[PDB]
Homo-oligomer: A and B are copies of this chain.
Amino acid sequence: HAFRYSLNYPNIGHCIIINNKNFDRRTGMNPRNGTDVDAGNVMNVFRKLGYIVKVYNDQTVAQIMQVLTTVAHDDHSRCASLVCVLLSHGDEGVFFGTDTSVDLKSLTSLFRGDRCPSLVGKPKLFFIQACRGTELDPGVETDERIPVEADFLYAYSTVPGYYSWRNTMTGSWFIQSLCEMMTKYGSELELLQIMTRVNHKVALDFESTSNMPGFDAKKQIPCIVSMLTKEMYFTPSE
């Protein structure tokens, strides 16, 4: 059929980063210090690959809806793909604007095939750094028609139900691992191969340190959800 998504387009595509740091006091949510380190790394990595990167800082739900609805109604005929990086608080199934929460389904379904015709058949890649609940992982010691939901990737920082971890100096565990593995393998491996090595790095090299009771020595594994129908490479040749 065609084993890999085509890069035969003027632009590899757009990279939209929603980077939320400071939250409405009334929500009780804390600032996400170190998220600027995350967003800056992501920006340079996807700029190097040729994406047109745009960063939106401290966005409310309705501002996110607006930004993403404009991108979905834009024309992507000349783009090979779409990348969206989401950095915020969250809970199970939801993402936080600066003001309150919104269903992730509401963000991503804006790019469904029947609502975004210029991206039909093209990879729509979402990287989501946000909590998905409040559980902690204690770790364990060892020794043609197509479906409208097709061609999405949802690379979540953590398992459903669980907290996701962030360092205030180096940024979130998942995003600094993604940037390091993109930089090292972005021109040699395909995306799910890259994400498996993200998984390994987060799983093995990070463990929490905290004096807050119950929060010490915890682990994290990311959760890579693929509806992709082809291999995704970021360069024409390996």
Q: Report A's interface with B, CB cutoff 8 A.
A: 1, 3, 113-114, 117, 120-121, 137-150, 159, 162, 190, 192-193, 195-197, 199-200, 203-204, 207, 219-231
Contact = CB atoms under 8 A, between A and B. Distances in A.
Contact of A200 (B117, B196, B200, B229): B229
B121 A142 contact: yes
A149 B221 CA distance: 7
Nearest to A4: B196
A193 B219 CA distance: 27
A162 to B, nearest CB: 7
Contact of A224 (B147, B148, B226): B226
B148 A120 contact: no
Given A1-B204, A142-B144, A150 B199 contact: yes
Contacts of A220: 147
B117 A140 contact: yes
Nearest to A120: B142
A153 to B, nearest CB: 10
A80 B99 CA distance: 48
B143 A139 contact: no
A192 B114 CA distance: 27
Q: Lowest 5 CB-CB distances: which A-B pairs, in order?
A: A113-B140, A147-B219, A200-B229, A139-B145, A147-B221
B149 A145 contact: no
Given A142-B145, A144-B142, A199 B227 contact: yes
Contacts of A113: 139-140
A146 B140 contact: yes
Contacts of A192: 192-193, 196, 226
B221 A145 contact: no
